[PDB]
Amino acid sequence: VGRALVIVVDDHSGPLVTELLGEAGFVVDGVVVVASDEVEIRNALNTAVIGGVDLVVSVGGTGVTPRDVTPEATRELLDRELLGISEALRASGLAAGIVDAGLSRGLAGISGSTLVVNIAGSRAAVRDGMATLGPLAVQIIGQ
Amino acid sequence: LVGRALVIVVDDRTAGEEDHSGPLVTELLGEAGFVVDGVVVVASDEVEIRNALNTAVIGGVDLVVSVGGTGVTPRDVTPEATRELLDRELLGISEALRASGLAAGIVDAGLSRGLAGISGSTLVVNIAGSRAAVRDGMATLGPLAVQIIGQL
Amino acid sequence: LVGRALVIVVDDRTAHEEDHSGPLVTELLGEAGFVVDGVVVVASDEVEIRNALNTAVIGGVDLVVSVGGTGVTPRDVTPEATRELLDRELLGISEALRASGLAAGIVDAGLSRGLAGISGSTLVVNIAGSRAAVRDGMATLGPLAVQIIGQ
Amino acid sequence: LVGRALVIVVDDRTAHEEDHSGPLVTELLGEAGFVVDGVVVVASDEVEIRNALNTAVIGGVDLVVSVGGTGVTPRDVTPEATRELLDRELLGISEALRASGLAAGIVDAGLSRGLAGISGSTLVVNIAGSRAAVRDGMATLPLAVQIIGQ
Amino acid sequence: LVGRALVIVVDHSGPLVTELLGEAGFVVDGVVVVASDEVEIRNALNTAVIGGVDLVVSVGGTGVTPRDVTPEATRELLDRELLGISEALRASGLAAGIVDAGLSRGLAGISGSTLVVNIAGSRAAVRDGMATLGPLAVQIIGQL
Amino acid sequence: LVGRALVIVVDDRTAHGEEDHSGPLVTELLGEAGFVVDGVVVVASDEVEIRNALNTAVIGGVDLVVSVGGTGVTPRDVTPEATRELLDRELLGISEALRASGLAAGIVDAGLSRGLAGISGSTLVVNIAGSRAAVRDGMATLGPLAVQIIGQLS
């Protein structure tokens, strides 16, 4: 229980992430859409951390093509990394047969007091990714 | 597209407070490429479920999906209602589901007594009632059903 | 106190040598919130196992965990001593255990033919006999048995 | 090393065309430490399959592996063929294979209705028919060596 | 049978880690207790490595809180990292419902010829971790 | 054709004379996964030599390089260190899947492999462990993942 922001990298994801975040027990302060620009994405994350949200979910920008800069945007902001979250989403993704989730370069970790998690872009990856993530997020905001 | 489906919501309160499962199953079956022909609500009652099921198979459907009544209490009797209808168990479905659920921490999906099988030419699958379990089972079921209804 | 438990240890040696599995099951069960009322040692004989199991369900206990006699040899007869008194099979417990065991490298847990199920209002689970299988089974069983006792 | 095995290929095409699975199964059974007595081929028929399984249990072999006939189509009768012959079901084998195949994205392994168990003193295991399913099935099946150990 | 181990507890777990390493095939030379202080931990690990023990298991200090510094303390000691061990423990943890193991920032790796492994603090994590780690440790101690 | 693949076999004994049992098998399995195999390069378990073979294979433009061996934990196992120099981006997900699949199947060298996966230039590079069991399990898990990576890169 806390409050959370969504960041779509340009999607149908924003309303859906809002919904699943809602069911996980989160107030969704809003949806911010940004381009696959490392600076535009980093600016959006940093701004959110400073603003004191408990949780920031990004969606998209985690595949292999050079336009996919979500991870490297994110890494500058992380005080500590939570591979546990990255591994659980990827593991879960493959199991379900969702490959962009299986192969995601998304990070997870803590910036200030905020948990940041990068989820992959496809609808399947958002569903499976929130299902898995929501519990783990809850436990971490608990510190 | 892929096919048609009928959704049975096994719940006493729903049979008549508001159905949440039924819309949700429909939304998710839609993304997998199914049209839901209908949502039938029914009490945790062995016969009522068996009839609902039997009627769906009889009717023009490729996929039947029950939600609820898969637990352990006296009144969870969806598996009992479902067994005679099967011609051939699909244990990999029950297992894929039970395992996905457990992996995700959803003990009612994880511990579901729910079955899976062909009843004639129709895929029947029982799913557990919790929202988490509907969301996970469907994510797991959709591709599996897509490939079973194709080999038929 | 989440509920009470009886332990049945299925081992010839023990029946005819000191019991290692039973104190262990009890430690592990008591971490998951259970109190073990007793350990009952029996031999790998269909009849003995079944009588002990029925006497447990007749003791009214919340959980009965057998240990041993789930393998393939002709004397591993725990599963068939147990089937007759289940009103409902709980495959997802049996599947969870074998899956967990298999992933830990514990082949006897991995391939156990041990059943799980409800007998009246009593949860009944059969676990393989190695110390490894006992330790991994109870970790995996503890939570599931807590929730099922919700009933 | 470990024991002797016989391979039954279930495939109409092959029973009427070069067998693809038989040599592969033999190959992998070898790496797992089995001598293969050889490959019986068999049309996708309940009774014909059943008798080849019978023949093999009676014929003394430690492991019988079936390939194919595990799907949902009507001619997929290998499970029906196999069940009257088991004295003891080993669901944890069926379970492991299914779980492994589905984990690897192999849907005919993942959903296979193939059975596994002990008939007399023989380990019998039905594996699904696709090439991917054979490789994953056999790499998972080690469980074989354990079980023949007793 | 197989090798010598040292337990570092970051402040219950000591006797338990001892018991389970035992069953895994490991003599336990000692149990060192340490106070959640990057410096203290790194030194206990230094000492453990320098004395040539085969396996060092640390317990605790792997969560997200300010004073969870066990990973920071271990990183510079690792010659080679072994994510497969960390992955196996985290995945095992998660499957078993044990979130502290599931989300543990704990590392695994080789320092000198010593296998070092950070396990999370909860009793369940120690049990799940040790059951998983045991055979992995045995195999690595073989190839070293 | 999904693409071209190259096999690098990292094994001192193979390098110093002995028959290569790993290289043909990876050729077959890549065949089935959908790849034409440009050939097999054998290398000793030396970081330079290995780095040089990967670097040459990348610049030559194959879609996929699989290496075999040198992922363990002896001093000699330097495939990861060689590979790391060359990666523009890591696909931790591929390594996680191979380790996870290995462990489940009881194949501990796959389980514990320090293998990397990643993108070098426009080449998918993946280190697999050297055991015969690890090569079979590795290629099975990898084949489809690599199909989907080549396609995102074209």
Automatic annotation (TrEMBL), chain B:
Gene3D superfamilies listed in its UniProt record: MoaB/Mog-like domain
Keywords: Molybdenum cofactor biosynthesis
Pathway: Cofactor biosynthesis; molybdopterin biosynthesis
Residue ranges occupied by any MoaB/Mog domain in the UniProt entry: 5-148
InterPro entries the UniProt entry points to: MoaB/Mog-like_dom_sf, MoaB/Mog_dom, MPT_Adenylyltrnsfr/MoaC-Rel
CDD domains (alphabetical): MogA_MoaB
Pfam families: MoCF_biosynth (PF00994)
Protein name: Molybdopterin biosynthesis protein
Organism (species): Mycolicibacterium smegmatis (strain ATCC 700084 / mc(2)155) (Mycobacterium smegmatis)
GO BP terms in the entry: Mo-molybdopterin cofactor biosynthetic process
UniProtKB/TrEMBL annotation, chain C:
Tagged with keyword Magnesium: no
NCBIfam families named in the record: molyb_syn
Pathway note: Cofactor biosynthesis; molybdopterin biosynthesis
InterPro entries noted in UniProt: MoaB/Mog-like_dom_sf (IPR036425), MoaB/Mog_dom (IPR001453), MPT_Adenylyltrnsfr/MoaC-Rel (IPR051920)
Keywords linked to the UniProt accession: Molybdenum cofactor biosynthesis
Biological-process GO terms, alphabetical: Mo-molybdopterin cofactor biosynthetic process
Domain of life where this protein originates: Bacteria
CDD domains: MogA_MoaB
Official protein name in the record: Molybdopterin biosynthesis protein
PANTHER family referenced in this protein's UniProt entry, alphabetically: MOLYBDENUM COFACTOR BIOSYNTHESIS, MOLYBDOPTERIN MOLYBDOTRANSFERASE
Pfam families to which the protein is assigned, alphabetical: MoCF_biosynth (PF00994)
Keyword DNA damage attached: no
Source organism of this protein record: Mycolicibacterium smegmatis (strain ATCC 700084 / mc(2)155) (Mycobacterium smegmatis)
Boundaries of every MoaB/Mog domain copy: 5-148
